[PDB]
What we know:
Two copies of one chain form a homodimer.
Chain A: E1 8-12, E2 16-24, H1 30-46, E3 56-61, E4 64-74, H2 78-87, E5 97-99, H3 103-110, E6 116-118, H4 121-135, E7 143-147, E8 156-159, E9 168-173, E10 177-184, E11 187-194, H5 198-209, H6 214-223, E12 231-232, H7 233-237, E13 251-253, H8 261-266, H9 269-295, E14 300-303, H10 311-324, E15 331-334, H11 340-347
Amino acid sequence: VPRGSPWFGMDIGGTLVKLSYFEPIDITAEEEQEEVESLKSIRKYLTSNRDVHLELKDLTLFGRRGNLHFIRFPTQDLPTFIQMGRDKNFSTLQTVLCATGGGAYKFEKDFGNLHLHKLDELDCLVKGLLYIDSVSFNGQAECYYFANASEPERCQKMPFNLDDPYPLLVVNIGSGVSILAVHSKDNYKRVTGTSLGGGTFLGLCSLLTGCESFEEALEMASKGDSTQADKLVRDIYGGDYERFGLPGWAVASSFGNMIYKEKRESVSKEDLARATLVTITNNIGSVARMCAVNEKINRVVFVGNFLRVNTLSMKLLAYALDYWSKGQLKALFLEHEGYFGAVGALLG
Amino acid sequence: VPRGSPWFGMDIGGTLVKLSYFEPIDITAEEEQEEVESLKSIRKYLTSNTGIRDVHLELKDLTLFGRRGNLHFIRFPTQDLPTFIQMGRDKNFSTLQTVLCATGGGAYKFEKDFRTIGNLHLHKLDELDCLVKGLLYIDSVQAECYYFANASEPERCQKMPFNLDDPYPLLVVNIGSGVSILAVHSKDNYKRVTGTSLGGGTFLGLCSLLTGCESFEEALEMASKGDSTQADKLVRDIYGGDYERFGLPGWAVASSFGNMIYKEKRESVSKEDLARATLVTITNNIGSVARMCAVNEKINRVVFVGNFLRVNTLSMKLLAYALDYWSKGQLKALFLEHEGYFGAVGALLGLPN
């Protein structure tokens, strides 16, 4: 049972803070009632620029019934959150501030007197992810996948039952990629990873197209055709590679056609961006598949800041895993992605 | 045993032809003695503009199909291929009387071109099948196989002979524009287990877009002079040192080209640095795929071949480093001296019998 109150957990990023807080519903003390009213006021102010729809209602946490809320706000407003806490007499924002995230340390610097208790991102991620999945999404599906993944322009989002997720392979895609094998609530480890993640995508896009943000890079990619920069098996064999059954549409060499000056001249920014995304997603799908095989795990879930913009990346990842596993593995995703670190921090 | 004589095999590429031919040592017939003198004249003509390098590749006094002889290796422009065919015919080679069993991406265009000036059936052989047959034969007959000692330090690692007498099982990583990984269990039992599209063509393609270079040789030259850490984001850039919790050295790459998301970094990064980053990204990834395939296939002998390894020792050393890293010192990357001629040798072994 957490000492002070109210109960919340935060994931301080370089730009945004992800905060999860618990709203108790069985209240008998006037002081707790206004504590709940203060939290609502705080939420409304901080979010004054979907998350509301992620609210988990009437769940039992630490023996008490309540609603779990999720909000995100600029790290620029974190000092305000802290002061609101002290002004509204929150004992949890008194002692020391617990939190995860990369902007955590940076923040404690800019910030008066305050002692930060830094928690590990991957540890918080795992704990929170497992917890949310255990309490379900208000009885509905917290986990989903894309049926007919082999057809990205036609696949459909469908729920997936992850009752007993164990064992589980968690592929975390941020600037880079960490892959965790989760055997139980307390048994898991980072089995491997790849340096070809979201940072490589944006990094290469910025140099090849001049884009200025992750949002812009993805937008270009959605409009491009990767097969204009990539050399396909068909470009080599004039169709499928019969001998080893490689289909003609399979990518033979990423950016392979960019070795010809002429091809480089006509290739569009949007094409290079989509080719960059396809190279990254197909490679991640391969690493995940081989790791799943080696770990003997058949449930692969993808999380990370890289999946927070468009569903395009998720669909290409589904397409990739389906391809490398010859349809045996399905790429899984979670509705509360982005808030697991926060939830993990709250549990701790 | 092959039907015709003399025995040779060719790998026909877009611009050059790789040819391997057998020079028998125990001759009793005058006609064969003449075939041997004819081969030497043909070699001299075709190689008169790598020439000295190929000559040094000659394998002396080995045994092929029961006979003692020398295996020769030459390369010559595909433009002179018709002359080679005519020379053989004029010199009475029976191996060129009706069918030619060759491999190589340019084999078909040759069938098209030559069809208009001669009667010779082309029987196309698969590159990968030739690669494996040749590789297994050359390894069977100094040190043909080598690795780099102290591979964890590319700047000081040293090329050392590696005895590969027990070839099976064997994981063959073929790196061309793309990557094919073959698991070889015995002389006639192997299969393509997987691959990656991030190969040689990816390095050249990206390099040409990022640095403006016009060739593989230039791209690799730029890469040799650059520092990838100027473009890549290391684990230290994020944690200000090592990532204790999960034991990730501060020098490990966290995100390839990950520092290029900042204008400040893009302003100061050099073309040489971007080229090296491109090479590092590709070699580290291939090392990872290979190691995972090795573990899953339960094979601890990983050989790297392919045209991507012909213009530089830098790529070989980087792959050795990558495989050493991913296997935490348990696997050593292997290479072969006759690398570029396996396809041609495989074709020779595939002569009609």
